[PDB]
Design a protein around this ligand. Structure first.
Ligand SMILES: c1c[nH]c(C2CNC2)n1
Ligand SMILES: c1c[nH]c(C2CNC2)n1
Length: 330
């Protein structure tokens, strides 16, 4: 089997991407944030504290003839940005782009933190990291991809995120029309539960490529590109007036600037992030200070190849017995 679903930016800055997901019988369609940096499929629901729902579409398990309470199961997740959610668990039929999994754990939120309430466009998360990170207790549950993978024509999914435009998540096949050149594959460590790999270096604009190993994770659920402070300083030094602002929480730059590109290495191959992808717009409405799309990972403990990087590539998440990642230009 295969599936193919369009993923759409939630706003004009590509702050996140939402993909429609059918849950239950009859189908209830929710727009979920596909997140290769976490491993829980959780949704706003009829159980979510009413004051914490503000415009999201909710899953109502009592209206689904295939929903079953997973007795005694609870879940609770805290993400790196300090956001969180928790609740109980149903199993139900879940379909993405024509690919159907029966018995998928659907984690129903009883509580969500403020930043989830405030994103009216995101009805929940669909985790695509490794199932070892799933938070369901006392019986850990599998991701949608892990449940689907035996049925898939090939045990892979691909992320093809657009810059200020829709893109595609495919399951079970690699669309050879969706990229240019060849896909370069690179090793993955699953030891932390992430799609963790080692980039071979970077270049800033037209500058020379610096060969240096940068371990990090391919995380569709993170907006920006978080890299070591040395790398990020070298990037922003090429932008007149750019500075790190403690009050804003990262590098800012004059909105009048034209940003240089940023290249990252995948083996001997190179992915070029155009400068415009690194512009996240005014720090506040009407400001002439703009927020940068490349930020330091120094306070995080891990480097993160988020959407800023991934959207410049066609990315293969290969879930074979030994997982690997593949990157192609497009
Ligand atoms: C999807 C990813 N991140 C989020 C919340 C936490 N910041 C807003 N929703
Ligand atoms: C809130 C939801 N997901 C996340 C991170 C994990 N990958 C992005 N924060």
């Amino acid at each position: 089997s295969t599936g193919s679903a369009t993923t759409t930016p939630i706003d004009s800055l590509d702050d996140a991407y939402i993909t429609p997901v059918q849950i239950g019988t009859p189908a209830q369609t929710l727009n979920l944030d596909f997140d290769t940096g976490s491993s829980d499929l959780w949704v706003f629901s009829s159980e979510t504290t009413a004051s914490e729902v503000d415009g999201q579409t909710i899953y109502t398990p009592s209206k689904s003839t295939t929903a079953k309470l997973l007795s005694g199961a609870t879940w609770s997740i805290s993400y790196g940005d300090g956001s969180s959610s928790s609740g109980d668990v149903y199993t139900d039929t879940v379909s993405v782009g024509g690919l159907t999994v029966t018995g998928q754990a659907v984690e129903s939120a009883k509580k969500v933190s403020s930043s989830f309430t405030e994103d009216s466009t995101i009805d929940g998360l669909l985790g695509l990291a490794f199932s070892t990170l799933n938070t369901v207790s006392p019986t850990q549950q599998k991701t949608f991809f892990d449940n689907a993978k035996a049925s898939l024509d090939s045990p892979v999914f691909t992320a093809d995120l657009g810059y200020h435009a829709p893109g595609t998540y495919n399951f079970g096949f690699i669309d050879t029309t969706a990229y240019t050149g060849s896909i370069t594959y690179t090793a993955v460590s699953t030891k932390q539960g992430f799609w963790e790999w080692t980039s071979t270096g970077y270049a800033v604009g037209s500058g020379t490529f610096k060969s240096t190993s940068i371990d990090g994770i391919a995380d569709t659920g993170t907006t920006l590109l978080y890299l070591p402070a040395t790398v990020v300083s070298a990037y922003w030094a090429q932008v007149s007036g750019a500075k790190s602002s403690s009050s804003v929480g990262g590098y800012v730059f004059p909105c009048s600037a034209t940003l240089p590109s940023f290249t990252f290495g995948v083996g001997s191959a190179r992915i070029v992030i155009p400068g415009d992808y690194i512009d996240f717009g005014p720090i506040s409405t009407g400001s002439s200070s703009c927020f940068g799309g490349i930020q330091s990972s120094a306070g995080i403990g891990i480097n993160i190849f988020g959407d800023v990087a991934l959207k410049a590539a066609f990315v293969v998440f290969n879930g074979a017995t030994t997982p690997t990642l593949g990157f192609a230009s497009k």
